Design a protein around this ligand. Structure first.
Ligand SMILES: *CCC(=O)NCCCOc1n[nH]c2ncc(-c3cn(-c4c(F)ccc(NS(=O)(=O)c5cccc(-c6ccccc6)c5)c4F)nn3)cc12
Length: 291
C-alpha cells in the first residue's frame, strides 16, 4: 500500500464538482508524473485488494492518499483523454477497421482480466466510453472498475449513463458479469458510428425505451454483418444469451481472420454521409413517439 502525500501533489482540474468520487488531474511532484486522483469518503478494507490488479488495458494504481479526513486513490493519467471525447471529435476521422479491432480487443481483454484473471472477480457495472481512456500510445485503459463495490459516490444526475446500462442494471436487479457485455456492445457501436448514443434523448426516456420496449441503438443497414451480429448478441434482453468476454475475444479473433471484413467495414465507415440519416430517422421517431 504505497502512500502518496498531499504535500506531494498539485491539483489543476476537477471532474465532478469536488464531490466524493470526483477525479482530479494532478501532478505527483516527487515523481514528476502526471496523475489522476479520485476523492473518496473513506478507504474500505475490502477494496484494498483492488490495489493489486494490474493489466495493460486497466488504469494502473499508483497509491492512496491518507490524510484524514481526506482520502484518495492515485492512478496513471492517460495522455490522450477519454474514448468518449475522442469519438465525438474530428480526431476520430482516422478510425478504420484496424483501429476499431485493436480498440475493441483492448476493452475486451481488459474486461476479461477483470472478470476472470485478477485475484478477485470484478464486475464493472458502469462500463462506458467516458470510463475508457487513451494512453499516449493508443492503448485503451478501463477506469472506475472498482466503484460498483467501493466508491458508491462515483456511481452517484445520471442521464449520461442510461444509454450504456443493461436492462437489469437500469432495474437495479441482481447482476451477472454479462451486464458489462451489454455496456461493451454500446462502446463498440460508438466506435463504429462515431455517434453519441441516443443523442438528443433524455436519460430517463432512454431507460424506459431500453427496459420496456426492448429498444436498442440503430445499426445502419450497411454496417458489416459481423459487427451487427456481435452487437445484437451483446444487447440481448436476456443476460444469459450474452457472450462472455472470452467469447468476444474469440469472435474478434475470427473477424480479424476474415479477409473480406476490412473492405466491407472500411467502405461502411467512409459512407457515413449516407447511413447517418438512418440514425437520425430513428431518433426522430423516438422523440415523436414521446410527443
Ligand atoms: C468532468 C470533466 C471530464 O470529463 N474529464 C475526463 C477527461 C479526461 O480524463 C482523463 N484523461 N486521462 C485520464 N486518465 C485517467 C483518468 C481516471 C483515473 N481514475 C481513477 C482514479 F484516479 C482513482 C481511482 C479510480 N477508481 S478504480 O475503480 O478504477 C481503482 C483502480 C485501482 C485501484 C483502486 C483502489 C481502490 C481502493 C483501494 C485501493 C485501490 C481503485 C479511478 F477510476 N478515474 N479517471 C481520467 C483521465
Amino acid at each position: 500500500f504505497v502512500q502518496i502525500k498531499f504535500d506531494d501533489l498539485q491539483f489543476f482540474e476537477n471532474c465532478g464538482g469536488g464531490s466524493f468520487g470526483s477525479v482530479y488531474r494532478a501532478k505527483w511532484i516527487s515523481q514528476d508524473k502526471e496523475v489522476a486522483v479520485k476523492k473518496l469518503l473513506k478507504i474500505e478494507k475490502e477494496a484494498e485488494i483492488l490495489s493489486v490488479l494490474s493489466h495493460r488495458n486497466i488504469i494502473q494504481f499508483y497509491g492512496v492518499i491518507l490524510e484524514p479526513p481526506n482520502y484518495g486513490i492515485v492512478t496513471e493519467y492517460a495522455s490522450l483523454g477519454s474514448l468518449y471525447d475522442y469519438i465525438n471529435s474530428n480526431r476520430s476521422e482516422e478510425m478504420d477497421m484496424d483501429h476499431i479491432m485493436t480498440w475493441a480487443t483492448d476493452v475486451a481483454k481488459g474486461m476479461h482480466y477483470l472478470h476472470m484473471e485478477a485475484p478477485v472477480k470484478v464486475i464493472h457495472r458502469d462500463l462506458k466510453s467516458r470510463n475508457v481512456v487513451i494512453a499516449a500510445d493508443g492503448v485503451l485503459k478501463i477506469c472506475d472498475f472498482g466503484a460498483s463495490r467501493f466508491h458508491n459516490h462515483t456511481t452517484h444526475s445520471l442521464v449520461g449513463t442510461f444509454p450504456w446500462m443493461a436492462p437489469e442494471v437500469i432495474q437495479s436487479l441482481p447482476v451477472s458479469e454479462t451486464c458489462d457485455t451489454y455496456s461493451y456492445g454500446v462502446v463498440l457501436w460508438e466506435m463504429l458510428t462515431r455517434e453519441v448514443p441516443f443523442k438528443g434523448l433524455e436519460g430517463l426516456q432512454v431507460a424506459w425505451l431500453v427496459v420496456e420496449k426492448n429498444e436498442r441503438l440503430t445499426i445502419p443497414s450497411s454496417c458489416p454483418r459481423s459487427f451487427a451480429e456481435l452487437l445484437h448478441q451483446c444487447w440481448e434482453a436476456d443476460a444469459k444469451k450474452r457472450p462472455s468476454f472470452k467469447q468476444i475475444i474469440s469472435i474478434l479473433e475470427s473477424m480479424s481472420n476474415d479477409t473480406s471484413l476490412p473492405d466491407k467495414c472500411n467502405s461502411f465507415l467512409h459512407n457515413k454521409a449516407e447511413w447517418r440519416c438512418e440514425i437520425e430517422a430513428t431518433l426522430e421517431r423516438l422523440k415523436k413517439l414521446e410527443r
